[PDB]
């Protein structure tokens, strides 16, 4: 039996708001280590990897490992019923076709029973890498950039160098270029082993940005010819990583 209690229910609300639009169905792997989820969007251009360490929960219990096929859209509709102050408890049985979510208003107790589903998932083996460029910067700042360059064009060219990173876009109206110089939650820092310049589809990035409320900062890891990794560290829970395949 699996039962995890989270006082900060808002985190779980935020996670789903950060995923439902990118991925509609996904397998939730529950282990004594915590909740893990890896999924690829329909077009297989991006990939998500969510990790919520068992230590981030006020209470956590998992006798036997579970793999719950969830419809994120549906789970999202259920979480919207939780207030931002509710204590969220997840509970599932081993031979169960359902997931139980209990919200406790900080005299209101809500109990939902979400039906699960069968999923023919496809998972990727992503080894630990040391990227050529790792940019740490304010998540709101990153969000602004993506939203904006989007009006200018479809793709963004991220150039990373030691003393700053540059985002560029081009369209029929002209071109746009934003330069961020290496400057707590308002700083910009770069760990660059080698300069890198990549081209990415702004459409997918503006989906990742839907995770901004999970962190005051985000990190961008790049290396030539490899998918970009945009990470949002869920405060003392774990993190949420978005991978974006480069353009050609």
């Amino acid at each position: 039996m699996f039962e995890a209690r989270l006082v900060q229910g808002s985190i779980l609300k935020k996670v789903l708001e950060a995923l439902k639009d990118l991925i509609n169905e996904a397998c939730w792997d529950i282990s004594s280590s915590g909740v893990n989820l890896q999924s690829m969007d329909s077009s297989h251009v991006s990939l998500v990897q969510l990790t919520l360490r068992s230590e981030g929960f006020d209470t956590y219990r998992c006798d036997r490992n579970l793999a719950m096929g969830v419809n994120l859209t549906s789970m999202s509709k259920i979480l919207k019923c939780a207030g931002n102050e509710d204590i969220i408890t997840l509970r599932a049985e081993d031979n169960a076709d359902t997931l139980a979510l209990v919200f406790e208003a900080p005299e209101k107790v809500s109990d939902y029973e979400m039906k699960l589903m069968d999923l023919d998932v496809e998972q990727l083996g992503i080894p630990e890498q040391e990227y050529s460029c790792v940019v740490k910067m304010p998540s709101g700042e990153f969000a602004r950039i993506c939203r904006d360059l989007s009006h200018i064009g479809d793709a963004v060219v991220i150039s990373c160098a030691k003393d700053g990173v540059k985002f560029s876009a081009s369209g029929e109206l002209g071109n746009g270029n934003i330069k961020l110089s290496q400057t707590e939650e308002e700083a910009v820092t770069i760990e660059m082993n080698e300069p890198v310049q990549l081209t990415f589809a702004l459409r997918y990035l503006n989906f990742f940005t839907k995770a901004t409320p999970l962190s005051s900062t985000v990190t961008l890891s790049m290396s030539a010819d490899v998918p970009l990794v945009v990470e949002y560290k869920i405060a003392d829970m774990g993190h949420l990583k978005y991978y974006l395949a480069p353009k050609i």
Partner: peptide, 18 residues
């Protein structure tokens, strides 16, 4: 040309019953 994530990493299909 938009490449796919499967172009870079080894995939392993999983059947989930629930």
């Amino acid at each position: 040309r938009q490449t796919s994530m499967t172009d870079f990493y080894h995939s392993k299909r999983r059947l989930i019953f629930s």
